[PDB]
Symmetry: C2
Subunit: 248 residues, 2 copies
Protein backbone atom coordinates (compact mmCIF):
# COMPACT_ATOMS: atom_id res chain seq x y z
CA UNK A 1 0.00 0.00 0.00
CA UNK A 2 1.31 3.46 -0.89
CA UNK A 3 2.21 5.60 2.14
CA UNK A 4 -0.17 8.33 3.26
CA UNK A 5 2.09 11.33 3.89
CA UNK A 6 0.82 14.33 5.81
CA UNK A 7 1.91 17.77 4.60
CA UNK A 8 1.73 20.72 7.00
CA UNK A 9 -0.50 23.64 6.00
CA UNK A 10 0.18 27.32 6.59
CA UNK A 11 -2.58 29.80 7.34
CA UNK A 12 -3.31 32.78 5.10
CA UNK A 13 -5.97 35.45 4.87
CA UNK A 14 -7.16 35.67 1.27
CA UNK A 15 -9.50 38.59 0.86
CA UNK A 16 -12.17 38.38 3.51
CA UNK A 17 -11.58 34.73 4.39
CA UNK A 18 -9.03 32.66 6.34
CA UNK A 19 -7.49 29.71 4.53
CA UNK A 20 -5.17 26.77 5.13
CA UNK A 21 -2.64 26.47 2.31
CA UNK A 22 0.12 24.20 1.07
CA UNK A 23 2.48 24.71 -1.82
CA UNK A 24 2.07 22.62 -4.94
CA UNK A 25 5.81 22.01 -5.23
CA UNK A 26 5.84 20.24 -1.86
CA UNK A 27 2.85 18.10 -2.81
CA UNK A 28 4.33 17.09 -6.15
CA UNK A 29 7.65 16.26 -4.50
CA UNK A 30 5.78 13.89 -2.16
CA UNK A 31 4.13 12.15 -5.12
CA UNK A 32 7.07 12.07 -7.49
CA UNK A 33 10.04 11.95 -5.14
CA UNK A 34 8.75 10.05 -2.13
CA UNK A 35 6.17 7.89 -3.89
CA UNK A 36 3.43 8.91 -1.47
CA UNK A 37 -0.18 10.01 -1.31
CA UNK A 38 -0.19 13.54 0.18
CA UNK A 39 -2.89 14.85 2.46
CA UNK A 40 -2.68 18.37 3.89
CA UNK A 41 -2.76 18.77 7.67
CA UNK A 42 -4.65 21.98 8.54
CA UNK A 43 -3.14 24.27 11.14
CA UNK A 44 -5.75 23.52 13.79
CA UNK A 45 -3.39 23.11 16.71
CA UNK A 46 -4.46 20.77 19.45
CA UNK A 47 -8.07 21.69 18.63
CA UNK A 48 -8.03 18.14 17.24
CA UNK A 49 -6.68 14.76 18.34
CA UNK A 50 -3.07 14.58 17.18
CA UNK A 51 -2.81 10.94 18.28
CA UNK A 52 -5.68 9.98 15.97
CA UNK A 53 -3.95 12.02 13.25
CA UNK A 54 -0.66 10.22 13.73
CA UNK A 55 -2.38 6.82 13.63
CA UNK A 56 -3.59 7.50 10.07
CA UNK A 57 -0.35 8.77 8.48
CA UNK A 58 2.79 6.90 7.39
CA UNK A 59 5.01 9.99 7.45
CA UNK A 60 5.03 13.75 7.78
CA UNK A 61 6.51 16.56 5.67
CA UNK A 62 6.96 19.83 7.59
CA UNK A 63 7.10 22.32 4.73
CA UNK A 64 8.87 25.62 4.26
CA UNK A 65 7.09 28.93 4.52
CA UNK A 66 7.70 32.69 4.37
CA UNK A 67 6.52 32.78 7.97
CA UNK A 68 8.76 32.37 11.01
CA UNK A 69 8.47 30.50 14.30
CA UNK A 70 7.50 32.88 17.10
CA UNK A 71 10.52 33.45 19.38
CA UNK A 72 8.61 32.83 22.61
CA UNK A 73 8.93 29.11 21.84
CA UNK A 74 12.67 29.32 22.50
CA UNK A 75 12.57 32.20 25.00
CA UNK A 76 14.12 34.44 22.37
CA UNK A 77 13.93 38.20 21.93
CA UNK A 78 10.70 39.67 20.61
CA UNK A 79 10.63 39.80 16.80
CA UNK A 80 10.90 43.02 14.87
CA UNK A 81 7.39 44.40 14.25
CA UNK A 82 6.14 43.23 10.89
CA UNK A 83 7.97 39.89 11.02
CA UNK A 84 5.70 37.29 9.42
CA UNK A 85 4.42 34.73 11.92
CA UNK A 86 1.85 31.92 11.85
CA UNK A 87 0.93 31.09 15.43
CA UNK A 88 -1.76 28.64 14.27
CA UNK A 89 0.93 26.66 12.45
CA UNK A 90 3.36 26.84 15.40
CA UNK A 91 0.58 25.45 17.65
CA UNK A 92 0.18 22.54 15.22
CA UNK A 93 3.71 21.64 14.22
CA UNK A 94 5.85 21.96 17.38
CA UNK A 95 3.85 19.34 19.34
CA UNK A 96 3.37 17.27 16.18
CA UNK A 97 7.15 16.99 15.59
CA UNK A 98 7.71 15.65 19.10
CA UNK A 99 4.76 13.26 18.97
CA UNK A 100 5.62 11.83 15.55
CA UNK A 101 9.22 11.10 16.45
CA UNK A 102 8.13 9.42 19.70
CA UNK A 103 5.63 7.30 17.74
CA UNK A 104 8.16 6.21 15.12
CA UNK A 105 6.49 8.10 12.27
CA UNK A 106 8.99 9.26 9.60
CA UNK A 107 9.60 13.03 9.57
CA UNK A 108 11.18 15.26 6.91
CA UNK A 109 11.53 18.97 7.70
CA UNK A 110 12.28 21.54 5.00
CA UNK A 111 13.46 25.11 5.82
CA UNK A 112 10.78 26.34 8.24
CA UNK A 113 10.15 22.69 9.06
CA UNK A 114 13.82 22.18 9.87
CA UNK A 115 13.64 25.24 12.12
CA UNK A 116 10.54 23.75 13.76
CA UNK A 117 12.42 20.52 14.47
CA UNK A 118 15.22 22.43 16.25
CA UNK A 119 12.82 24.57 18.30
CA UNK A 120 10.53 21.64 19.19
CA UNK A 121 13.43 19.83 20.92
CA UNK A 122 14.62 22.93 22.80
CA UNK A 123 16.91 24.77 20.38
CA UNK A 124 16.85 28.41 19.37
CA UNK A 125 17.00 30.42 16.15
CA UNK A 126 18.74 33.48 14.81
CA UNK A 127 15.95 35.68 13.50
CA UNK A 128 18.31 37.61 11.14
CA UNK A 129 21.10 35.25 10.13
CA UNK A 130 22.55 37.87 7.77
CA UNK A 131 23.12 40.28 10.67
CA UNK A 132 24.83 37.98 13.17
CA UNK A 133 28.27 38.80 11.75
CA UNK A 134 29.52 35.24 11.39
CA UNK A 135 27.27 34.19 8.52
CA UNK A 136 26.62 34.86 4.89
CA UNK A 137 23.32 36.29 3.69
CA UNK A 138 21.20 33.14 3.31
CA UNK A 139 18.13 34.95 1.98
CA UNK A 140 17.08 34.62 -1.63
CA UNK A 141 17.92 37.69 -3.75
CA UNK A 142 15.07 40.13 -4.01
CA UNK A 143 14.22 41.46 -7.46
CA UNK A 144 15.07 38.20 -9.24
CA UNK A 145 12.73 35.55 -10.68
CA UNK A 146 11.96 32.28 -8.94
CA UNK A 147 14.34 30.20 -11.07
CA UNK A 148 17.14 32.42 -9.75
CA UNK A 149 15.88 32.69 -6.19
CA UNK A 150 15.62 28.87 -5.88
CA UNK A 151 18.80 27.97 -7.76
CA UNK A 152 21.81 26.59 -5.87
CA UNK A 153 23.56 29.42 -4.09
CA UNK A 154 26.01 28.01 -1.51
CA UNK A 155 27.89 24.85 -0.67
CA UNK A 156 26.85 22.26 1.92
CA UNK A 157 29.35 20.17 3.90
CA UNK A 158 28.02 16.78 4.97
CA UNK A 159 29.17 15.67 8.42
CA UNK A 160 30.16 11.99 8.41
CA UNK A 161 28.38 9.15 10.14
CA UNK A 162 24.76 10.30 9.92
CA UNK A 163 21.66 10.14 7.74
CA UNK A 164 22.95 12.20 4.84
CA UNK A 165 26.17 10.17 4.64
CA UNK A 166 24.11 6.99 4.81
CA UNK A 167 21.89 8.05 1.92
CA UNK A 168 25.05 8.49 -0.13
CA UNK A 169 25.15 12.24 -0.67
CA UNK A 170 28.53 13.64 -1.75
CA UNK A 171 30.69 15.10 0.99
CA UNK A 172 30.13 18.61 -0.44
CA UNK A 173 27.29 19.68 -2.76
CA UNK A 174 25.46 22.90 -3.66
CA UNK A 175 22.08 23.86 -2.21
CA UNK A 176 19.60 26.65 -2.65
CA UNK A 177 19.04 29.12 0.20
CA UNK A 178 15.77 30.96 0.82
CA UNK A 179 15.91 31.77 4.52
CA UNK A 180 16.47 34.72 6.83
CA UNK A 181 16.41 32.64 10.01
CA UNK A 182 18.60 29.75 11.07
CA UNK A 183 19.84 27.60 13.93
CA UNK A 184 21.38 29.51 16.84
CA UNK A 185 21.57 27.02 19.69
CA UNK A 186 21.27 23.42 18.61
CA UNK A 187 18.71 21.43 20.55
CA UNK A 188 20.09 18.63 22.73
CA UNK A 189 19.74 15.22 21.18
CA UNK A 190 20.19 16.38 17.59
CA UNK A 191 23.00 15.26 15.32
CA UNK A 192 24.55 17.82 12.97
CA UNK A 193 24.11 16.41 9.45
CA UNK A 194 25.55 19.29 7.41
CA UNK A 195 27.12 22.74 7.68
CA UNK A 196 27.11 25.68 5.29
CA UNK A 197 30.59 27.14 4.60
CA UNK A 198 30.09 29.83 7.29
CA UNK A 199 29.37 27.18 9.92
CA UNK A 200 25.59 27.60 9.94
CA UNK A 201 23.91 24.30 10.83
CA UNK A 202 21.71 23.44 7.85
CA UNK A 203 20.77 19.80 8.45
CA UNK A 204 19.96 17.74 11.55
CA UNK A 205 18.76 14.27 12.53
CA UNK A 206 17.20 13.14 15.80
CA UNK A 207 19.46 10.86 17.84
CA UNK A 208 17.85 7.60 18.83
CA UNK A 209 14.63 8.27 16.91
CA UNK A 210 13.02 4.93 16.11
CA UNK A 211 12.37 6.08 12.53
CA UNK A 212 13.67 8.47 9.84
CA UNK A 213 13.88 11.98 11.27
CA UNK A 214 15.73 14.50 9.11
CA UNK A 215 15.58 18.24 8.64
CA UNK A 216 17.31 20.41 6.05
CA UNK A 217 17.44 24.21 5.84
CA UNK A 218 17.46 24.39 2.04
CA UNK A 219 14.48 23.67 -0.26
CA UNK A 220 14.97 20.27 -1.93
CA UNK A 221 11.41 20.09 -3.24
CA UNK A 222 12.43 22.61 -5.91
CA UNK A 223 12.58 20.80 -9.26
CA UNK A 224 13.32 17.72 -7.22
CA UNK A 225 13.22 15.06 -9.97
CA UNK A 226 16.04 16.97 -11.76
CA UNK A 227 18.42 17.42 -8.76
CA UNK A 228 19.87 14.07 -7.69
CA UNK A 229 20.97 15.45 -4.31
CA UNK A 230 17.43 16.68 -3.56
CA UNK A 231 15.78 13.59 -4.98
CA UNK A 232 17.89 11.29 -2.82
CA UNK A 233 16.47 12.95 0.30
CA UNK A 234 12.88 12.53 -0.84
CA UNK A 235 13.51 8.95 -1.92
CA UNK A 236 15.01 8.09 1.47
CA UNK A 237 12.01 9.68 3.23
CA UNK A 238 9.61 7.79 0.97
CA UNK A 239 11.24 4.44 1.70
CA UNK A 240 10.87 5.07 5.44
CA UNK A 241 7.21 5.98 4.93
CA UNK A 242 6.67 2.83 2.87
CA UNK A 243 8.24 0.73 5.64
CA UNK A 244 5.79 2.18 8.16
CA UNK A 245 2.91 1.69 5.71
CA UNK A 246 3.93 -1.94 5.26
CA UNK A 247 3.66 -2.67 8.96
CA UNK A 248 -0.12 -1.99 8.90
CA UNK B 1 -17.93 14.13 21.21
CA UNK B 2 -20.84 12.89 23.33
CA UNK B 3 -20.19 12.22 27.00
CA UNK B 4 -18.68 8.77 27.53
CA UNK B 5 -18.31 7.88 23.82
CA UNK B 6 -15.30 5.85 22.66
CA UNK B 7 -16.27 5.71 18.98
CA UNK B 8 -13.43 6.03 16.51
CA UNK B 9 -13.07 9.59 15.25
CA UNK B 10 -13.76 9.85 11.51
CA UNK B 11 -11.08 11.19 9.19
CA UNK B 12 -12.93 13.53 6.81
CA UNK B 13 -11.31 14.65 3.56
CA UNK B 14 -11.93 18.25 2.51
CA UNK B 15 -11.41 19.29 -1.11
CA UNK B 16 -8.77 21.87 -1.93
CA UNK B 17 -8.93 24.62 -4.52
CA UNK B 18 -5.87 25.80 -6.42
CA UNK B 19 -4.66 29.38 -6.28
CA UNK B 20 -1.55 31.38 -7.09
CA UNK B 21 -0.42 33.22 -3.98
CA UNK B 22 2.52 35.54 -4.26
CA UNK B 23 5.12 33.80 -6.36
CA UNK B 24 3.83 30.24 -6.00
CA UNK B 25 0.98 27.83 -6.75
CA UNK B 26 -0.91 26.56 -3.72
CA UNK B 27 -3.66 24.16 -2.75
CA UNK B 28 -6.07 25.83 -0.34
CA UNK B 29 -9.16 25.20 1.80
CA UNK B 30 -11.27 27.62 3.82
CA UNK B 31 -10.94 27.58 7.60
CA UNK B 32 -14.71 27.79 8.01
CA UNK B 33 -15.17 24.44 6.26
CA UNK B 34 -12.49 22.80 8.40
CA UNK B 35 -13.95 24.16 11.65
CA UNK B 36 -17.41 22.98 10.62
CA UNK B 37 -16.03 19.47 10.12
CA UNK B 38 -14.59 19.58 13.64
CA UNK B 39 -17.46 21.30 15.41
CA UNK B 40 -20.47 20.22 13.38
CA UNK B 41 -19.51 16.77 12.11
CA UNK B 42 -17.17 15.69 14.89
CA UNK B 43 -14.43 14.65 12.49
CA UNK B 44 -10.74 15.16 11.92
CA UNK B 45 -10.31 17.12 8.66
CA UNK B 46 -7.51 16.53 6.21
CA UNK B 47 -7.32 18.54 2.99
CA UNK B 48 -7.29 16.63 -0.31
CA UNK B 49 -5.01 18.45 -2.80
CA UNK B 50 -6.25 19.09 -6.32
CA UNK B 51 -3.87 16.62 -7.94
CA UNK B 52 -6.49 14.98 -10.17
CA UNK B 53 -5.92 11.42 -11.25
CA UNK B 54 -2.16 11.81 -10.93
CA UNK B 55 -2.64 9.90 -7.65
CA UNK B 56 -4.62 6.72 -6.89
CA UNK B 57 -7.99 8.10 -5.80
CA UNK B 58 -9.25 4.67 -4.74
CA UNK B 59 -6.29 4.21 -2.36
CA UNK B 60 -6.82 7.73 -1.01
CA UNK B 61 -10.48 6.94 -0.42
CA UNK B 62 -9.58 3.76 1.48
CA UNK B 63 -8.02 6.02 4.14
CA UNK B 64 -10.92 8.50 4.62
CA UNK B 65 -14.28 8.09 6.36
CA UNK B 66 -16.08 10.90 4.52
CA UNK B 67 -15.61 13.67 1.97
CA UNK B 68 -16.66 17.33 2.07
CA UNK B 69 -16.75 18.99 -1.37
CA UNK B 70 -16.36 22.66 -0.44
CA UNK B 71 -17.72 25.83 -1.98
CA UNK B 72 -15.52 28.16 -3.99
CA UNK B 73 -15.63 31.42 -5.95
CA UNK B 74 -14.57 29.36 -8.98
CA UNK B 75 -16.96 27.60 -11.34
CA UNK B 76 -17.05 24.20 -13.04
CA UNK B 77 -15.88 24.46 -16.63
CA UNK B 78 -18.92 24.07 -18.91
CA UNK B 79 -17.28 21.46 -21.20
CA UNK B 80 -18.14 18.89 -18.53
CA UNK B 81 -21.86 19.25 -19.29
CA UNK B 82 -21.63 20.41 -22.95
CA UNK B 83 -22.54 23.91 -21.88
CA UNK B 84 -21.98 27.15 -23.71
CA UNK B 85 -18.61 28.86 -23.44
CA UNK B 86 -18.22 30.89 -20.27
CA UNK B 87 -18.25 34.68 -20.41
CA UNK B 88 -14.65 35.96 -20.60
CA UNK B 89 -13.40 36.61 -17.10
CA UNK B 90 -15.26 33.73 -15.48
CA UNK B 91 -13.17 32.13 -12.73
CA UNK B 92 -12.41 28.46 -13.27
CA UNK B 93 -10.20 25.93 -11.46
CA UNK B 94 -9.53 23.13 -13.93
CA UNK B 95 -7.19 21.28 -11.56
CA UNK B 96 -10.02 21.13 -9.03
CA UNK B 97 -12.53 19.89 -11.64
CA UNK B 98 -10.07 17.14 -12.66
CA UNK B 99 -9.93 16.04 -9.01
CA UNK B 100 -13.50 16.37 -7.80
CA UNK B 101 -15.63 15.10 -10.65
CA UNK B 102 -14.02 11.64 -10.65
CA UNK B 103 -13.68 11.70 -6.86
CA UNK B 104 -17.43 12.22 -6.35
CA UNK B 105 -18.24 9.11 -8.37
CA UNK B 106 -15.50 6.96 -6.82
CA UNK B 107 -16.51 7.99 -3.30
CA UNK B 108 -20.19 7.13 -3.77
CA UNK B 109 -19.32 3.75 -5.34
CA UNK B 110 -17.07 2.99 -2.35
CA UNK B 111 -19.67 3.99 0.24
CA UNK B 112 -17.74 7.03 1.45
CA UNK B 113 -20.23 9.57 2.87
CA UNK B 114 -20.32 12.71 0.74
CA UNK B 115 -21.48 16.22 1.64
CA UNK B 116 -21.37 18.81 -1.17
CA UNK B 117 -21.61 22.51 -0.43
CA UNK B 118 -22.32 25.16 -3.16
CA UNK B 119 -19.65 24.37 -5.78
CA UNK B 120 -19.52 20.85 -4.37
CA UNK B 121 -23.29 20.47 -4.82
CA UNK B 122 -22.84 21.64 -8.40
CA UNK B 123 -20.01 19.11 -8.84
CA UNK B 124 -22.31 16.32 -7.61
CA UNK B 125 -24.92 17.26 -10.22
CA UNK B 126 -22.39 17.43 -13.04
CA UNK B 127 -20.63 14.21 -12.03
CA UNK B 128 -23.88 12.26 -12.44
CA UNK B 129 -24.73 13.76 -15.85
CA UNK B 130 -26.54 16.98 -15.02
CA UNK B 131 -25.81 20.48 -16.26
CA UNK B 132 -25.59 24.01 -14.86
CA UNK B 133 -26.77 27.52 -15.58
CA UNK B 134 -23.68 29.73 -15.51
CA UNK B 135 -25.77 32.91 -14.88
CA UNK B 136 -28.91 31.85 -12.98
CA UNK B 137 -30.12 35.47 -12.77
CA UNK B 138 -30.38 35.60 -16.59
CA UNK B 139 -32.46 32.43 -16.94
CA UNK B 140 -36.08 31.36 -16.78
CA UNK B 141 -37.97 32.49 -13.70
CA UNK B 142 -34.88 32.49 -11.48
CA UNK B 143 -33.98 35.35 -9.15
CA UNK B 144 -30.61 36.70 -7.99
CA UNK B 145 -28.82 34.20 -5.74
CA UNK B 146 -25.54 36.12 -5.63
CA UNK B 147 -24.21 37.68 -2.45
CA UNK B 148 -23.93 41.49 -2.12
CA UNK B 149 -20.19 41.84 -2.66
CA UNK B 150 -20.00 45.39 -1.26
CA UNK B 151 -21.01 44.21 2.24
CA UNK B 152 -19.18 42.59 5.17
CA UNK B 153 -19.12 38.81 5.50
CA UNK B 154 -21.80 38.94 8.20
CA UNK B 155 -24.26 40.34 5.67
CA UNK B 156 -22.99 38.30 2.72
CA UNK B 157 -23.41 34.95 4.56
CA UNK B 158 -26.63 35.70 6.46
CA UNK B 159 -29.87 34.01 5.34
CA UNK B 160 -31.23 35.75 2.24
CA UNK B 161 -33.96 33.54 0.74
CA UNK B 162 -36.33 30.80 1.75
CA UNK B 163 -35.78 27.07 1.20
CA UNK B 164 -38.65 24.61 0.71
CA UNK B 165 -37.94 21.01 1.68
CA UNK B 166 -39.43 18.36 -0.59
CA UNK B 167 -40.95 15.53 1.46
CA UNK B 168 -39.67 11.99 1.61
CA UNK B 169 -35.92 12.51 1.40
CA UNK B 170 -32.80 13.02 3.49
CA UNK B 171 -33.61 16.53 4.67
CA UNK B 172 -37.10 15.63 5.86
CA UNK B 173 -35.66 12.48 7.40
CA UNK B 174 -33.19 14.38 9.56
CA UNK B 175 -36.08 16.50 10.82
CA UNK B 176 -35.63 19.79 9.02
CA UNK B 177 -38.75 21.96 8.93
CA UNK B 178 -40.70 22.28 5.71
CA UNK B 179 -39.42 25.85 5.15
CA UNK B 180 -36.37 27.71 6.52
CA UNK B 181 -34.13 30.52 5.29
CA UNK B 182 -30.65 29.91 3.87
CA UNK B 183 -27.73 32.02 2.78
CA UNK B 184 -27.02 32.38 -0.93
CA UNK B 185 -23.49 32.99 -2.27
CA UNK B 186 -23.74 31.64 -5.79
CA UNK B 187 -24.35 32.77 -9.35
CA UNK B 188 -24.52 29.34 -10.98
CA UNK B 189 -27.10 26.62 -10.42
CA UNK B 190 -28.70 23.37 -11.54
CA UNK B 191 -30.10 23.27 -15.08
CA UNK B 192 -30.52 19.61 -16.03
CA UNK B 193 -30.97 17.58 -12.85
CA UNK B 194 -28.80 14.50 -13.12
CA UNK B 195 -30.63 11.16 -13.46
CA UNK B 196 -30.83 9.27 -10.19
CA UNK B 197 -30.79 12.40 -8.03
CA UNK B 198 -33.65 13.24 -5.66
CA UNK B 199 -34.69 16.87 -5.29
CA UNK B 200 -34.36 17.62 -1.58
CA UNK B 201 -35.25 21.32 -1.54
CA UNK B 202 -36.28 24.21 -3.78
CA UNK B 203 -35.67 27.94 -3.55
CA UNK B 204 -38.77 30.14 -3.98
CA UNK B 205 -37.97 30.69 -7.67
CA UNK B 206 -37.90 26.95 -8.37
CA UNK B 207 -34.12 26.58 -8.36
CA UNK B 208 -33.06 23.14 -7.15
CA UNK B 209 -30.85 23.82 -4.10
CA UNK B 210 -30.47 20.38 -2.53
CA UNK B 211 -30.13 16.86 -3.92
CA UNK B 212 -29.42 13.34 -2.69
CA UNK B 213 -28.13 10.35 -4.65
CA UNK B 214 -30.87 7.74 -4.82
CA UNK B 215 -29.48 4.28 -4.45
CA UNK B 216 -26.18 5.40 -2.94
CA UNK B 217 -24.95 2.86 -0.43
CA UNK B 218 -23.93 5.66 1.97
CA UNK B 219 -24.89 9.25 2.81
CA UNK B 220 -24.71 11.43 -0.29
CA UNK B 221 -26.17 14.94 0.07
CA UNK B 222 -25.48 18.27 -1.61
CA UNK B 223 -26.84 21.72 -0.83
CA UNK B 224 -26.42 24.95 -2.83
CA UNK B 225 -26.16 27.20 0.24
CA UNK B 226 -23.24 27.41 2.69
CA UNK B 227 -24.12 25.60 5.93
CA UNK B 228 -20.55 25.72 7.26
CA UNK B 229 -21.12 29.40 8.15
CA UNK B 230 -21.47 29.61 11.97
CA UNK B 231 -22.76 26.06 11.84
CA UNK B 232 -23.49 25.73 15.54
CA UNK B 233 -25.79 28.75 15.69
CA UNK B 234 -28.09 27.61 12.85
CA UNK B 235 -30.01 24.42 13.75
CA UNK B 236 -30.72 23.57 10.12
CA UNK B 237 -27.09 23.92 9.06
CA UNK B 238 -25.98 21.94 12.11
CA UNK B 239 -28.46 19.13 11.42
CA UNK B 240 -26.85 18.63 8.01
CA UNK B 241 -23.32 18.44 9.40
CA UNK B 242 -24.44 16.13 12.23
CA UNK B 243 -26.09 13.72 9.79
CA UNK B 244 -22.92 13.73 7.69
CA UNK B 245 -20.80 13.15 10.77
CA UNK B 246 -22.92 10.20 11.91
CA UNK B 247 -22.46 8.54 8.52
CA UNK B 248 -18.71 9.15 8.66
CA UNK B 249 -18.60 7.65 12.14
CA UNK B 250 -20.41 4.56 10.88
CA UNK B 251 -17.67 4.01 8.30
CA UNK B 252 -14.92 4.68 10.86
CA UNK B 253 -16.46 1.90 13.01
CA UNK B 254 -15.63 -0.58 10.23
CA UNK B 255 -11.85 -0.04 10.43
MG1 LIG C 1 21.39 28.65 3.45
MG1 LIG D 1 -29.52 30.46 -3.50
Amino acid sequence: RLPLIGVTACTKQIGLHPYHIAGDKYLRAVVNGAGGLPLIIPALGESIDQAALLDSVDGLLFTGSPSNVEPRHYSGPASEPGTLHDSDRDATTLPLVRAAIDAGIPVLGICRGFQEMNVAFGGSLHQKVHEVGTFMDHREPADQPLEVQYAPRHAMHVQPGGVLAGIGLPSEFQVNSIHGQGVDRLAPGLRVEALAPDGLVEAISVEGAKAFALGVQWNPEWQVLTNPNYLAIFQAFGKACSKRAGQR
